[PDB]
Amino acid sequence: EAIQTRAVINQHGTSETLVENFLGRAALVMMKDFEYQNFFKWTINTRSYVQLRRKFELFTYIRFDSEITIVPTIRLYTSYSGLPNLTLQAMFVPVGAPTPKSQDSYEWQSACNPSVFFKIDDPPARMTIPFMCINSAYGMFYDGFAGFEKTANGLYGINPANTMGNLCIRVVNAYQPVQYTITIRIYLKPKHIKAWVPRPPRTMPYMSIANTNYTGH
Amino acid sequence: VLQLKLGNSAIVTQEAANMCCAYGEWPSYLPDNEATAIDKPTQPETSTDRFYTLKSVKWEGTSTGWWWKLPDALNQTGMFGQNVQYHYLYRSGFLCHVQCNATKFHQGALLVVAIPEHQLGKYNTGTSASFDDVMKGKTGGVFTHPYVLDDGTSLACSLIFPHQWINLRTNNSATIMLPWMNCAPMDFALRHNQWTLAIIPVVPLNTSGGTTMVPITVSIAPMCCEFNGLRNAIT
Amino acid sequence: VLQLKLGNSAIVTQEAANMCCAYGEWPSYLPDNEATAIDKPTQPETSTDRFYTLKSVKWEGTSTGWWWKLPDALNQTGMFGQNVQYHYLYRSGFLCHVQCNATKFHQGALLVVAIPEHQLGKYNTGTSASFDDVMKGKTGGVFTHPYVLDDGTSLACSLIFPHQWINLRTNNSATIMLPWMNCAPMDFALRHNQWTLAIIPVVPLNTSGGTTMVPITVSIAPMCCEFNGLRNAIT
Amino acid sequence: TLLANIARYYTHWSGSMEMTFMFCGSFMATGKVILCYTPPGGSCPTDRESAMLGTHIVWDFGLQSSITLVIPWISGSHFRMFNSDAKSINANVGYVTCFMQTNLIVPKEAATSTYIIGFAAAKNDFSLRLMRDSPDIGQSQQLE
Numbered sequence: 001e002a003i004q005t006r007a008v009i010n011q012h013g014t015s016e017t018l019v020e021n022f023l024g025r026a027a028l029v030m031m032k033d034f035e036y037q038n039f040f041k042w043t044i045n046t047r048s049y050v051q052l053r054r055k056f057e058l059f060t061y062i063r064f065d066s067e068i069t070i071v072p073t074i075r076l077y078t079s080y081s082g083l084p085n086l087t088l089q090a091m092f093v094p095v096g097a098p099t100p101k102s103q104d105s106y107e108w109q110s111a112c113n114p115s116v117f118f119k120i121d122d123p124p125a126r127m128t129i130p131f132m133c134i135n136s137a138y139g140m141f142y143d144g145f146a147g148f149e150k151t152a153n154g155l156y157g158i159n160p161a162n163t164m165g166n167l168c169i170r171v172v173n174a175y176q177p178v179q180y181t182i183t184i185r186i187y188l189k190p191k192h193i194k195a196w197v198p199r200p201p202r203t204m205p206y207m208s209i210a211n212t213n214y215t216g217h
Numbered sequence: 218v219l220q221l222k223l224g225n226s227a228i229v230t231q232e233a234a235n236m237c238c239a240y241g242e243w244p245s246y247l248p249d250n251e252a253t254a255i256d257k258p259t260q261p262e263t264s265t266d267r268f269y270t271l272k273s274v275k276w277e278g279t280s281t282g283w284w285w286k287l288p289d290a291l292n293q294t295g296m297f298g299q300n301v302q303y304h305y306l307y308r309s310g311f312l313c314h315v316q317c318n319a320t321k322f323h324q325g326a327l328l329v330v331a332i333p334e335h336q337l338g339k340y341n342t343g344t345s346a347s348f349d350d351v352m353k354g355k356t357g358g359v360f361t362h363p364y365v366l367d368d369g370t371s372l373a374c375s376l377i378f379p380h381q382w383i384n385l386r387t388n389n390s391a392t393i394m395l396p397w398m399n400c401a402p403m404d405f406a407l408r409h410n411q412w413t414l415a416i417i418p419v420v421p422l423n424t425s426g427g428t429t430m431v432p433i434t435v436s437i438a439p440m441c442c443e444f445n446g447l448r449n450a451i452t
Numbered sequence: 453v454l455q456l457k458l459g460n461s462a463i464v465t466q467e468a469a470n471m472c473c474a475y476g477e478w479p480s481y482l483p484d485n486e487a488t489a490i491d492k493p494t495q496p497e498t499s500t501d502r503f504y505t506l507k508s509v510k511w512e513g514t515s516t517g518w519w520w521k522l523p524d525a526l527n528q529t530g531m532f533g534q535n536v537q538y539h540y541l542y543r544s545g546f547l548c549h550v551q552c553n554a555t556k557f558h559q560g561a562l563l564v565v566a567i568p569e570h571q572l573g574k575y576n577t578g579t580s581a582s583f584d585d586v587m588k589g590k591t592g593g594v595f596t597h598p599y600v601l602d603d604g605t606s607l608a609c610s611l612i613f614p615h616q617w618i619n620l621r622t623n624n625s626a627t628i629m630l631p632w633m634n635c636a637p638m639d640f641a642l643r644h645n646q647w648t649l650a651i652i653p654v655v656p657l658n659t660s661g662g663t664t665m666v667p668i669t670v671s672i673a674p675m676c677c678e679f680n681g682l683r684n685a686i687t
Numbered sequence: 688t689l690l691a692n693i694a695r696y697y698t699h700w701s702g703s704m705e706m707t708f709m710f711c712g713s714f715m716a717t718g719k720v721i722l723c724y725t726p727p728g729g730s731c732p733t734d735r736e737s738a739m740l741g742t743h744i745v746w747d748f749g750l751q752s753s754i755t756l757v758i759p760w761i762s763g764s765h766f767r768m769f770n771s772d773a774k775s776i777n778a779n780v781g782y783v784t785c786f787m788q789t790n791l792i793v794p795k796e797a798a799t800s801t802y803i804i805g806f807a808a809a810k811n812d813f814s815l816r817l818m819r820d821s822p823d824i825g826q827s828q829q830l831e
Binding site for chain 4: 529
C-alpha cells in the first residue's frame, strides 16, 4: 500500500552534524505540577526522558554549560478567567548547599544560591549555569563505587561528582483566596559542548534510571 | 532544401529550419559543480541522439489538436526506450520538429507550443486525471477544450511558452529546441514529464476542392541524454 | 593475493597469475592498413570486456576432460551474446582463466591447453560430427578419448599448443591469453570457432580421506571485441 | 550498523558506503562465492548466472579471508504527500547479494560448517540533514 517514491537528494556540507549542533538543542528536561508537594524541587539531570538520555549516552564524557528557561502556566479552578500575576522565585542550589524543605524555609534567602524573581505574565525566566563539576567533564557512565562502605556497595555506577545541583521554584505570593495549579516546564540548552569517547547506541529498553539494566524487547 | 541529420537519422526540410531555442538556452549537460553532490551520471551518446518519427496524424476541419508528453512519447521506442527501462535516473533535452504537407490551395494555422509541466485537467469533476488519461505513449493525446489548454488557463496567453507558428501560406515547418526543464539535476522518466508538445489548430484547415485532410509529421530527438552509471566497479 | 579486474568484473586469484601469451602476441586490434580493403569495424569497448564465469564442473577420479569452444561458449551470454546476435561480423581475442579448489591432501594434474581450430572427430564412423556435437554452448563438451585429443592426434604432442599445467601440489590456477587466430581479418561468430579451451586430467584426482570431488572454475573474457558498424550514416 | 543508528536521527542522507566480509572457516577450507551489486532500480538477481552478468566479484575465500566492496552511491529521505493520507516510503536503492560459485571443500579433520560475517560503514563523502527524533525506542504517550 505504501507508495515507493524517490528524490534526487542534492546536498553538501557537514556543519549540521557538528556535536555542538547534535546535542545543542533546547529540550524539555522536566515538567511538574503543584497546587499552590507545595513547591517545585528537582535535581537537574539529563536522564529523565528516554530520548535525551539515549542521545547523551552516545558519548562517555561530556562537558557543557547549562542554559535553563522556565515556562510557567497557571490554570484556575471552580469563577472568572482572570489569572493572577503571581511572582515566582527559582533558586539554583549547588551540591554543597542545603535545599529548602518547606515553602517558607530559611534557605530561600540564602544570598549565595542564585535566585531569579519573575512574574507569570512576563517573558520566561532564563539563566545560564556554568560547568560546575569537580572533574573536567561529566561522566555519562561510571564503572565503580562511591566508596568502600557497605552502603556504597548498593550504589554501583553512581559518582557523587556527577550531580548537577537542585532547582527549587516557589510562589512568593501568599495563598490567594482562589484555587490554582501551577505547571512548570524546564528547558535545558547545553552550550560549549565537548564530547569524548563515543559509545555504541542503546538498543534495549531501560529498566531504571541509574543502573543501565535491560529487559526484553 | 537542407537536411537535419542526427546520428543515423536524417530529415529533409524546406529550408525553414529557423530553430527556436526555448528561453534562449541550448541543451548542454549536467554541469560539473552540480554533479559532485549527487550520483555520477554517464553520457550514453549512443543512438539515443536520433530523430524518432511518430505516426503521422490527420489534420481535418474539425480537429481540436494533439499533444505528446516527453519523455513519455519515447519511453517504449528504440535505444532511448531501452535505456529508460534499464536506468532509474535520466536527464535529457529534446528537439521537436513538426512538418505539414499541403498544397497552395489549402489554408489553416497551427500553434506548435511546448508547454512545460503541463498538468492536465478535467471538466466538471473533482477527481484528478487517471494514469491512462495522462500517459498516452507515442500515440499522443487529443485536446478536448483547446480554448483553455485543457488546464483552465487561456490558449491566448499560451504564446508566453516556447512556440512556433505554422501558417500554410507562409511555412509548413516548426522547430523548437527544449533544454532540461526541472527543479532537480536529474529525474525519473517513467512517471514524470517535463515538456508537452502541443499542436493546436488556431485557424481551421479549409479548402474547396482539396483533399480535406493533410498529414502532420512529428519528429522528436533526445539531445543530451544522461543516465545513472550501471557499471561502476565495486572493488 | 591479487585481483584480475576487467570492467565491472573482478576475480580474486592466488598470486599465480603468470599469464601465458599465446605465441607471444598480445591481442591488440585490427591494424589500420588491414582495414582499408574491408568493411570498417567499430570498437564496442562496452561490458563485452568482462570476465564471464561459467558453471563450475566437478573433477572426479574418472573424469576424461572438458572443452569449451570460443566464441560459441559466450554466444548466448550477456552483452557479448547480444552483440554477436545483432552483428554479422566479429573479431576478438580472449583471456581464459582456470582455477581449482583443493586441499593439501589432494593430488592430480590438469593440462589446460588452448587448441586453435580444433576440428572435432568421431570414432569408428565415416559421418562427420553433427551440429549438436560441436556447438555445445556454455555447457561445454566432454572428451571421449582424451589420449588422441578427439581428433586422431596425440595428447602427448599437444604440448606444442598454448598451454599451462595445474599441479595441485604446486599451483591451482592457469591463465592463457589468446590473440586473434584466423586467416581472415574478421569472421562470423555464429558458425565458426577459433579456439577450444581444453582441460584434460593427465594425472587422475586422488585422495584417501578427501571429498573425492573438487570444482574447476572457468572464466573467459573477450579482450578486443570489434564488430561491423550498425549505424553508419547513409547521407 | 552504527551508520543506520546515527542516520535515524536525520532525514536526508546521501553518499558512498564501504562494506567488508570476513570468512571465519578453517585454514585449509576453500571455496568460491560470488558477491553481486545491483544498482538502484534494477532487479535483484535470482541465480548465479544473473549475479555473474551484473557487477560482481568472484571471491575465493580460501586465499584471502577479507573482501571489501565499495558501494558508489546510496540516497534516501522521508516523504509525506500533500493532500493524501497514503504512506510514502523511499524506494529501494539497490542490493548486495551473494551466490555460491563452488561448493565448500574442507579436510576430513576440519569442521564441515563455516561462517561469514560482514561489516558496513560510510565513506568521507556521506552527509546528513534535518535532524529529527529517533523512533528507536519511542513508547512515550503524554510527554510524561
